[PDB]
Design an enzyme around this catalytic site. Structure first.
Site, PDB file in Angstrom:
ATOM      1  N   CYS A 106       0.860  -1.150  -0.106  1.00  0.00           N
ATOM      2  CA  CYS A 106       0.029  -0.007  -0.106  1.00  0.00           C
ATOM      3  C   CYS A 106       0.976   1.306   0.060  1.00  0.00           C
ATOM      4  O   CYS A 106       1.692   1.566   0.843  1.00  0.00           O
ATOM      5  CB  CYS A 106      -1.115   0.084   1.131  1.00  0.00           C
ATOM      6  SG  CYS A 106      -2.171   1.412   1.064  1.00  0.00           S
ATOM      7  N   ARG A 109      -0.354   4.644   2.851  1.00  0.00           N
ATOM      8  CA  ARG A 109       0.073   4.414   4.376  1.00  0.00           C
ATOM      9  C   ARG A 109       0.502   5.580   5.095  1.00  0.00           C
ATOM     10  O   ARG A 109       0.487   5.619   6.335  1.00  0.00           O
ATOM     11  CB  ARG A 109       1.130   3.567   4.553  1.00  0.00           C
ATOM     12  CG  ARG A 109       0.502   1.989   4.443  1.00  0.00           C
ATOM     13  CD  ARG A 109       1.576   0.939   4.544  1.00  0.00           C
ATOM     14  NE  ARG A 109       2.692   0.798   3.700  1.00  0.00           N
ATOM     15  CZ  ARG A 109       3.747   0.045   3.628  1.00  0.00           C
ATOM     16  NH1 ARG A 109       3.994  -0.523   4.970  1.00  0.00           N
ATOM     17  NH2 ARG A 109       4.419  -0.064   2.305  1.00  0.00           N
ATOM     18  N   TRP A 278      -9.369   5.924  -0.874  1.00  0.00           N
ATOM     19  CA  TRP A 278      -9.567   6.926  -2.059  1.00  0.00           C
ATOM     20  C   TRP A 278      -8.630   6.315  -3.231  1.00  0.00           C
ATOM     21  O   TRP A 278      -7.509   5.835  -2.882  1.00  0.00           O
ATOM     22  CB  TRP A 278      -9.599   8.390  -1.902  1.00  0.00           C
ATOM     23  CG  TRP A 278      -8.490   8.957  -1.206  1.00  0.00           C
ATOM     24  CD1 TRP A 278      -7.016   9.180  -2.026  1.00  0.00           C
ATOM     25  CD2 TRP A 278      -8.061   9.379  -0.079  1.00  0.00           C
ATOM     26  NE1 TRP A 278      -6.102   9.808  -1.139  1.00  0.00           N
ATOM     27  CE2 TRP A 278      -6.718   9.935   0.194  1.00  0.00           C
ATOM     28  CE3 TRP A 278      -8.826   9.184   1.302  1.00  0.00           C
ATOM     29  CZ2 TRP A 278      -6.277  10.259   1.332  1.00  0.00           C
ATOM     30  CZ3 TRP A 278      -8.372   9.957   2.289  1.00  0.00           C
ATOM     31  CH2 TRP A 278      -7.223  10.418   2.444  1.00  0.00           C
ATOM     32  N   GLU A 283      -4.516   3.633 -10.832  1.00  0.00           N
ATOM     33  CA  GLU A 283      -5.467   2.415 -10.576  1.00  0.00           C
ATOM     34  C   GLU A 283      -6.462   2.431 -11.619  1.00  0.00           C
ATOM     35  O   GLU A 283      -6.707   1.329 -12.245  1.00  0.00           O
ATOM     36  CB  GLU A 283      -6.112   2.340  -9.178  1.00  0.00           C
ATOM     37  CG  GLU A 283      -4.898   2.304  -8.262  1.00  0.00           C
ATOM     38  CD  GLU A 283      -5.435   2.223  -6.688  1.00  0.00           C
ATOM     39  OE1 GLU A 283      -6.008   1.190  -6.391  1.00  0.00           O
ATOM     40  OE2 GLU A 283      -5.510   3.261  -5.874  1.00  0.00           O
TER      41      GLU A 283
END
Ligand code: HEM
Ligand code: HEM
Ligand SMILES: Cc1cc(N)nc(COCC[C@@H](CN)OCc2cc(C)cc(N)n2)c1
Ligand SMILES: Cc1cc(N)nc(COCC[C@@H](CN)OCc2cc(C)cc(N)n2)c1
Ligand SMILES: C[C@H](O)[C@H](O)[C@H]1CNc2nc(N)[nH]c(=O)c2N1
Ligand SMILES: C[C@H](O)[C@H](O)[C@H]1CNc2nc(N)[nH]c(=O)c2N1
Ligand SMILES: [Zn+2]
EC number: 1.14.13.39
Lengths: 402, 404
Positions: A106, A109, A278, A283
């Site tokens: 991720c 973070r 979000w 992506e």
């Protein structure tokens, strides 16, 4: 020996000593590196339990306190008698944030301490799961001003089947398999779309039909629940300067909410614990719209931009992709919906690596996932060495429930 | 079923198992507790067993395993080690081992080409003047007026007691980088150290952004000597853009020949400390890394300003737009100058084909994902969606400490 971690742009060097706290194995050995792979009794639970209790009281500075010791006895008594135990709500909130903090893949973070945690462990039916899921979406969406959240449903129990959300995300577009092999909609969701029809959903026939949820209470067939359309915020995609872009009729949903991963805290397992933040723009614009095995819209866009499709060396693909990412950012900005581009996201991840170095002496990070899918060496994270390893609390993969 | 790494392509949905990794003798940086895959940096009977393994590879590649010629060669090798502590390769063993080292290289995306490598045997070289001649010949052959040819030149192996043959420069062609008064650098910042060594050894420095460096060549037990490449041996491509007319006015250029010169070629335990090899460039090496790394030429902002982009906000994607045009300019200029080059799309497609060839030939292919995926447009190339197993096979190109 502790890994020497180098940043090749700045010339700077750290040592990861946090990895020594990894009690869980990864896919690699001395003979062969497997890091690019995407997928893989009481005494043992008890030691995971104590370690986690220790983490918690240390997090609040109360280590060695009466409160700490009585809590350890409580857990010890519960496990010895029942082969399991239960978390206090504040421990659960601590563990959920820690799971996110520890998630190697991720890039978001920097946000880890700001997580809304809904305790849904008092859930007893698919109907109840649904109401909880709805409140989560409502809260997290917040009319486009997105807020990070997690909802945690009842833990696994040696007796029965798990609570599960069959969908991989709470919001997903249908993929309709044609007889001639092709797919209308999102090819990643062909199998879940098919399962929904099996369980009695009336399918649509569009490219962006929002799927219903398949919610499963223990040892019961999963049940179908259509999300109220007004709950699901969506952004029409247009481009700031290319007028024809809107005509493509592309859109995407606001809320990225992962709903198939297991949450492990202190050795307890939460088979249904959907979570959301979000989107990072790449992506949507790169992976979801340009993957050859997704919506795969690169050629369409390139033909519109009038690019030379006949040869790789015109970089038609690269030019189209950039415009597509730009449209996503533009349209989300115009619709006042939270988004972060891959440059801002990776800059803030760098800051995060630095915070974590000071607080913990390292940060588990998976380079292939952290570096974005376009413009990699254009972002600072490309140039940063990273050490990947598993800390607990963790989000894990688990089998699909069918 | 199979007990070897399972390798998945997520675009095609296809599976393979890597069985080749079972032939890895040398351990890499990873353990079960932690993955160090993104880190850029990691005799006696020990020699004999590496030699034996290499000879076995040789005889397999010519299909004579168990043959009398094979068992005789093994004996000849242990006899030679037996009485000297070292041994020497036949000519065709060297050619095979050089090709295999390229083939084995996990960071190289160009490996579809591995079978086609010109091996210049230079194991008779006995001075620094003579290395210079061999190097010039290599550049002339490899450059071939723009129709580039893969090549390697092999200088004498490491020897007990005696000092190494070394090329000090990291590449045959490198632009100078001069440290300024105002702390900044003129030229290529990657080359500051080698630049300053050239000057300490009596090179008269220029002051351009693209001054080609001299070679610092070192023969056994001698101080390195300095040699200037005759300019006409060094082909360069001035950079222009197909539609952006002002781009030519930037005065950017790059050299045609990528020639790595500081790596050690290891075969059968023998160590070739000076063994420069060259291919042709993939466009992203120049246009993305060399021209746009913040710690390299760092021209992104200059190009973006000329393109009139909004450089004050990350969300305009100004970096992405500029980097794309810079890459297009690299490709277009190389094409016009008729100098071989390959784009990151053609290159990765060919690597996929290589992977499939190697699956059938050897049962796997060691590959370093982070290095194989290009530095722009990653997921737009098919390698992004291919899982990869990274491991060390020998013959190998290895890093070695700087000679100074
Ligand atoms: C706040 C904004 C956030 C951003 C921008 C963000 C960004 C991302 C991105 C880009 C990925 C890559 C996954 C992919 O390529 O599909 C990812 C993975 C992940 N993130 Fe986040 N994240 C956010 C919040 C969160 C939250 C709230 C959680 C959990 C509480 C979380 C946990 C994860 C996990 C577990 C993964 C790995 C998923 C997998 O392996 O399939 N992130 N994140
Ligand atoms: C035929 C054309 C070739 C192309 C397009 C090519 C492409 C590349 C690229 C793009 C890289 C990574 C570059 C970087 O990021 O700095 C690379 C690395 C490498 N290639 Fe090639 N290559 C070619 C030929 C060769 C040849 C002829 C050899 C040796 C005989 C070779 C051996 C290597 C090695 C050892 C590396 C790794 C260098 C390191 O670890 O620092 N390649 N190749
Ligand atoms: C919270 C969050 C925010 C944000 N911007 N993005 C995300 C990531 O989206 C998750 C996609 C995940 C699914 N678990 O990774 C893709 C994936 C995972 C797996 C196991 C299989 C597969 N085909 N694809 C999560
Ligand atoms: C033969 C060849 C062809 C081609 N197109 N490209 C290449 C790649 O150039 C290799 C550059 C290598 C140096 N060993 O990577 C740069 C580097 C590596 C390392 C370990 C450190 C450093 N500072 N810089 C080689
Ligand atoms: C095989 C390879 O590891 C795979 O395609 C990974 C690479 N990096 C990724 N990075 C992110 N953020 N998301 C992904 O799905 C992937 N896919
Ligand atoms: C930290 C990281 O390993 C480093 O920036 C790597 C990433 N991938 C790379 N890939 C290639 N081809 N060349 C490189 O120099 C690098 N650098
Ligand atoms: Zn690894």
């Amino acid at each position: 020996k502790f890994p020497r971690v180098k940043n090749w742009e700045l010339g700077s060097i750290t040592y990861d000593t946090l990895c020594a706290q990894s009690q869980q194995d990864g896919p690699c050995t001395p003979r062969r590196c497997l890091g690019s792979l995407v997928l893989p009794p009481a005494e043992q639970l008890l030691s995971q339990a104590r370690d986690f209790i220790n983490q918690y009281y240390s997090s609040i500075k109360r280590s060695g306190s009466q409160a700490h010791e009585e809590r350890l006895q409580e857990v010890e008594a519960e496990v010895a008698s029942t082969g399991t135990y239960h978390l206090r709500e504040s421990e659960l909130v601590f563990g959920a944030k820690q799971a996110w903090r520890n998630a190697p893949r991720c890039v978001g973070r920097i946000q880890w301490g700001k997580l809304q945690v809904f305790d849904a462990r008092d859930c007893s039916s698919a109907q109840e799961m649904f109401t909880y899921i709805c409140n989560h979406i409502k809260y997290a969406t917040n009319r486009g001003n997105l807020r990070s959240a997690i909802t945690v449903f009842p833990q696994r129990a040696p007796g029965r089947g798990d609570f599960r959300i069959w969908n991989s995300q709470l919001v997903r577009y249908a993929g309709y398999r044609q007889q001639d092999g092709s797919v209308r909609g999102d090819p990643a969701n062909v199998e879940i779309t098919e399962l929904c029809i099996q369980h009695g959903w009336t399918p649509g026939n569009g490219r962006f039909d929002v799927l219903p949820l398949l919610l499963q209470a223990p040892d019961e067939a999963p049940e179908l629940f259509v999300l109220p359309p007004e709950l699901v915020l969506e952004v029409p995609l247009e481009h700031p300067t290319l007028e024809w872009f809107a005509a493509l009729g592309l859109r995407w949903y606001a809320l990225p909410a992962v709903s198939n991963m297991l949450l492990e805290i202190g050795g307890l397992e939460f088979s249904a614990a959907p979570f959301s933040g979000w989107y990072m723009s790449t992506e949507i614009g790169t992976r979801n719209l340009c993957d050859p095995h997704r919506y795969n819209i690169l050629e369409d866009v390139a033909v519109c931009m009038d690019l030379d499709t006949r040869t790789t060396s015109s970089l038609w693909k690269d030019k189209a992709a950039v415009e597509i990412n730009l449209a996503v950012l533009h349209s989300f900005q115009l619709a006042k919906v939270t988004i972060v581009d891959h440059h801002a996201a990776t800059v803030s991840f760098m800051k995060h690596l630095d915070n974590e170095q000071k607080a913990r002496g390292g940060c588990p990070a998976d380079w292939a996932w952290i570096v974005p899918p376009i413009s990699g060496s254009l972002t600072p994270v490309f140039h940063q060495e990273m050490v990947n390893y598993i800390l607990s609390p963790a989000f894990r993969y688990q089998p699909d429930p069918w």
